[PDB]
Design a protein around this motif. Structure first.
Motif, short mmCIF file in Angstrom:
data_model
loop_
_atom_site.label_atom_id
_atom_site.label_comp_id
_atom_site.label_asym_id
_atom_site.label_seq_id
_atom_site.Cartn_x
_atom_site.Cartn_y
_atom_site.Cartn_z
N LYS A 22 -8.24 -14.95 1.88
CA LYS A 22 -7.77 -15.67 0.77
C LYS A 22 -6.74 -14.63 0.07
O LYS A 22 -5.80 -15.06 -0.57
CB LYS A 22 -8.66 -16.04 -0.15
CG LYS A 22 -9.80 -17.09 0.35
CD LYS A 22 -9.36 -18.07 1.01
CE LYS A 22 -10.19 -19.39 0.86
NZ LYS A 22 -10.02 -20.56 1.71
N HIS A 23 -7.03 -13.58 0.18
CA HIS A 23 -6.41 -12.23 -0.55
C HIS A 23 -4.97 -12.00 0.14
O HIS A 23 -4.78 -12.36 1.29
CB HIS A 23 -7.10 -10.98 -0.63
CG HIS A 23 -7.54 -10.36 0.53
ND1 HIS A 23 -8.68 -10.80 1.40
CD2 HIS A 23 -7.07 -9.28 1.28
CE1 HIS A 23 -8.80 -10.43 2.48
NE2 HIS A 23 -7.95 -9.26 2.30
N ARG A 24 -4.08 -11.60 -0.67
CA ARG A 24 -2.76 -11.24 -0.12
C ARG A 24 -2.87 -9.90 0.88
O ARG A 24 -3.51 -8.93 0.55
CB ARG A 24 -1.66 -10.84 -1.21
CG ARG A 24 -0.41 -10.46 -0.74
CD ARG A 24 0.46 -10.18 -1.95
NE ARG A 24 2.12 -9.84 -1.67
CZ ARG A 24 2.79 -9.28 -2.40
NH1 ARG A 24 2.41 -8.51 -3.37
NH2 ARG A 24 4.20 -9.42 -1.84
N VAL A 25 -2.22 -9.81 1.97
CA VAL A 25 -2.19 -8.80 2.70
C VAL A 25 -0.66 -8.59 3.08
O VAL A 25 -0.40 -9.54 3.66
CB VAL A 25 -3.22 -8.82 4.08
CG1 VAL A 25 -2.93 -7.58 4.87
CG2 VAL A 25 -4.53 -9.05 3.63
N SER A 26 -0.16 -7.51 2.69
CA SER A 26 1.38 -7.22 2.80
C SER A 26 1.53 -6.20 3.47
O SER A 26 1.42 -5.01 3.22
CB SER A 26 1.80 -7.34 1.43
OG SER A 26 3.38 -6.84 1.64
N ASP A 27 1.81 -6.51 4.86
CA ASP A 27 2.35 -5.37 5.80
C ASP A 27 1.07 -4.21 5.94
O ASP A 27 1.17 -3.39 5.82
CB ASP A 27 3.72 -4.92 5.43
CG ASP A 27 4.13 -4.04 6.78
OD1 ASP A 27 3.73 -4.24 7.90
OD2 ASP A 27 5.24 -3.28 6.37
N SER A 28 -0.19 -4.78 5.99
CA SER A 28 -1.16 -3.96 6.03
C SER A 28 -2.06 -3.42 4.76
O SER A 28 -2.99 -3.18 4.86
CB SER A 28 -1.43 -3.18 7.12
OG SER A 28 -0.89 -1.76 6.55
N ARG A 29 -1.47 -3.80 3.51
CA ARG A 29 -1.90 -3.34 2.51
C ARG A 29 -2.84 -4.56 1.79
O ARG A 29 -2.23 -5.70 1.52
CB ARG A 29 -0.57 -2.95 1.68
CG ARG A 29 -0.96 -2.98 0.16
CD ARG A 29 0.17 -2.36 -0.78
NE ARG A 29 -0.45 -1.78 -1.59
CZ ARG A 29 0.41 -0.71 -2.10
NH1 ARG A 29 1.59 -0.16 -1.86
NH2 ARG A 29 -0.15 0.24 -3.09
N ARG A 30 -3.87 -4.24 1.52
CA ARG A 30 -4.81 -5.20 0.79
C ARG A 30 -5.21 -5.08 -0.47
O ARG A 30 -5.46 -5.78 -1.29
CB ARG A 30 -6.09 -5.52 1.75
CG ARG A 30 -6.82 -4.19 2.01
CD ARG A 30 -7.89 -4.46 2.93
NE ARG A 30 -9.25 -3.96 2.67
CZ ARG A 30 -9.73 -2.70 2.99
NH1 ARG A 30 -9.20 -1.99 3.69
NH2 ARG A 30 -10.90 -2.57 2.63
#
Length: 121
Positions: free
Chosen positions: A69-77
């Motif tokens: 459910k969390h945002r993962v932006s180009d591998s960053r969590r």
């Protein structure tokens, strides 16, 4: 419980708690802060708060992440944030890290204003 059940419990608690205004948000002392389209949940604070109503932290976090459910932006969590005591981002602060979750995974189109206290880096 099991990784699936524990995940669902934690997410059900967080989501329905924010929806019913039952978990503190947007306060100098809160673990949850709204910001620019996202809900920031600080860790380990948000899991300790779950635990308080329901290692153990490691279990819930692992179970939570498996649900994506969390945002993962180009591998960053994880994002860092500064939490200030004064509104308008000044004075003493505490540096925090945690998850970003898209507003619409939690909230109708029906939500609190953004935090006065948290700045995302």
């Amino acid at each position: 419980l099991s990784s699936t059940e524990l995940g669902d419990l934690f997410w059900s608690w967080l989501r329905d708690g924010l929806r019913e205004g039952d978990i503190p948000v947007n306060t100098a002392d809160a673990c949850v802060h709204l910001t620019c389209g996202f809900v920031f949940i600080s860790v380990p604070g948000v899991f300790f708060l779950f635990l308080k109503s329901h290692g153990r932290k490691e279990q819930v976090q692992a179970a939570f992440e498996k649900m994506r459910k969390h945002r993962v932006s180009d591998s960053r969590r994880f994002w860092q944030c500064c939490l200030y005591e004064e509104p308008g981002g000044r004075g003493r602060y505490k540096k925090l890290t945690g998850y970003l979750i898209k507003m619409s995974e939690i909230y109708n189109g029906n939500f609190p204003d953004d935090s006065l206290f948290l700045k995302v880096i």
